[PDB]
């Protein structure tokens, strides 16, 4: 979803209260959002 810049889909499906994740679990996804210029996903990971 990040490679295609689908922020709404990620918010609706990936990041939900039903699922669980950790801050260190999305380190590499944060790096590849930074280097691929995905500001919406940077903001999503920051606020998640």
């Amino acid at each position: 979803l990040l490679e295609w810049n689908q922020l709404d889909l990620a918010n609706d499906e990936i990041f939900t209260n039903d699922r669980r994740w950790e801050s260190a679990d999305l380190q590499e996804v944060m790096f590849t959002a930074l280097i691929k210029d995905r500001p919406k996903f940077v903001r999503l990971f920051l606020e998640n």
């Binding site: 990041f15 939900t16 209260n17 039903d18 699922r19 669980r20 994740w21 606020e47 998640n48």
Partner: protein, 387 residues
């Protein structure tokens, strides 16, 4: 202060050993290891362990001023039992801790972990904390440093930093003593407890919040058992609602409002108990989990069948209802039915009405609905107008 706490507050310990085969290692049924046990610990012949019979009450030994980081703001904490009454708890809070009588009490019972910092929810809770500060209100949250409680503490700290000359914000964190991670530092060696969490490792136990003004760690003499502080929180809320103060603009009683947002079984139980205790509840729409279920249920005006509630539950909480068995699902359906049975004591912050002062509007509407559905509303023109 210390003498009153010692002579009025007590702790609990696993005094009868009831180690279970399914339990790991050879710890008590309470979860405490045999080495970490009180002196003269007998072994119970019965295979059933309870906190009332197989547990003994002993004077508390974990209270005082809690400290975080290195030069951070000093907090407060106290270890106490579930059987502890609400009268002397209120006495300790007000008289022996120098807390003004609240003109409003907000019981924030939301998601215990994984809270999304969406701008809408951020604005909603910032407005809620601003209202609490303006009205001189108390915020009753959990003491854990996770999710919504962490953001509430952060907003409280921000408000204290911004307006130092304004009224102080009281943010009581009612947690469980059996889930505190970095324990053995809250026990007394006047005394300041350093709850350092920078070097704390990753453990299943909860971590106390650093920005909460006060902490009420409820101890049932167990370890690793959550949902222990709920009983004492409900009793304290009931006492606050039943409390009478002559200087009140709410007909002589302290206003009490339950703020719900998402959550799971614990949030649903808290909402049900608040509804039972005649306490208005405010549910924020768009939060998912149980809050959106309640919003959808109160939006409709059907015959309140179990099929609709089950459909809403599987729509908003698919994985949870899939995991829970049939009996638990039936109990949840009964809880939602009980909550919806009293639709007057329920206010929803609609997503469409995303304007300004939404939180104040919802809280005022809940308070006015509670006032109208009471014996005072018969001829309280002045009281309703002033409210």
């Amino acid at each position: 202060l210390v003498n009153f706490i010692q002579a009025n507050f007590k702790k609990r310990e696993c005094v009868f050993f009831t180690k279970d085969s399914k339990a790991t290692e050879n710890v008590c049924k309470c979860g405490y290891a045999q080495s970490q046990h009180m002196e003269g610990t007998q072994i119970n012949q019965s295979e059933k362990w309870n906190y009332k019979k197989h547990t003994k009450e002993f004077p508390t030994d974990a209270f005082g001023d809690i400290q975080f980081e290195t030069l951070g703001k000093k907090g407060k904490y106290i270890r106490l039992s579930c059987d502890t009454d609400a009268e002397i708890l209120y006495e300790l809070l007000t008289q022996h801790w120098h807390l003004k009588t609240p003109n409003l009490v907000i019981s924030v019972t939301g998601g215990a972990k994984n809270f999304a910092l969406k701008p809408r929810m951020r604005k909603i809770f910032s407005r809620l904390i601003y209202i609490a500060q303006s009205k001189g209100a108390w915020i009753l949250t959990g003491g854990t440093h996770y999710g919504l409680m962490k953001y509430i503490g952060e907003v409280v700290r921000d408000n204290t930093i911004s307006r130092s000359s304004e009224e102080n914000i009281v943010a009581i964190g009612i947690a469980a003593w059996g889930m505190v991670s970095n324990r053995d530092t809250l026990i007394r060696n006047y005394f300041l407890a350093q709850y350092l969490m920078d070097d704390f490792t990753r453990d299943p136990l909860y971590i106390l919040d650093n920005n909460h003004t006060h902490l009420l760690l409820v101890d049932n003499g167990c370890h690793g058992h959550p949902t222990v502080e709920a009983k004492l929180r409900n009793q304290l809320e009931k006492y606050i609602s039943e409390r009478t103060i002559q200087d009140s603009n709410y007909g002589g009683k302290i206003p009490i409002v339950c703020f719900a947002q998402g959550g799971g079984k614990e949030t649903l139980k808290a909402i049900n108990t608040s509804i039972k205790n005649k306490i208005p509840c405010v549910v924020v729409e768009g939060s998912g989990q149980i809050a959106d279920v309640i919003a959808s249920l109160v939006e409709v005006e059907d015959a309140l069948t179990s099929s609709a509630v089950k459909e809403k539950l599987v729509r908003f909480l698919p994985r949870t209802v899939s995991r829970l068995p049939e009996e638990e699902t039936e109990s949840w359906i009964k809880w939602l039915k009980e909550i919806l049975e009293c639709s007057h004591l329920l206010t929803v912050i609609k997503m469409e009405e995303a304007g300004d002062e939404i939180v104040s509007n919802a809280i005022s509407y809940a308070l006015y609905k509670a006032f109208s559905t009471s014996e005072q509303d018969k001829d309280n023109w002045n009281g309703q107008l002033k409210l």
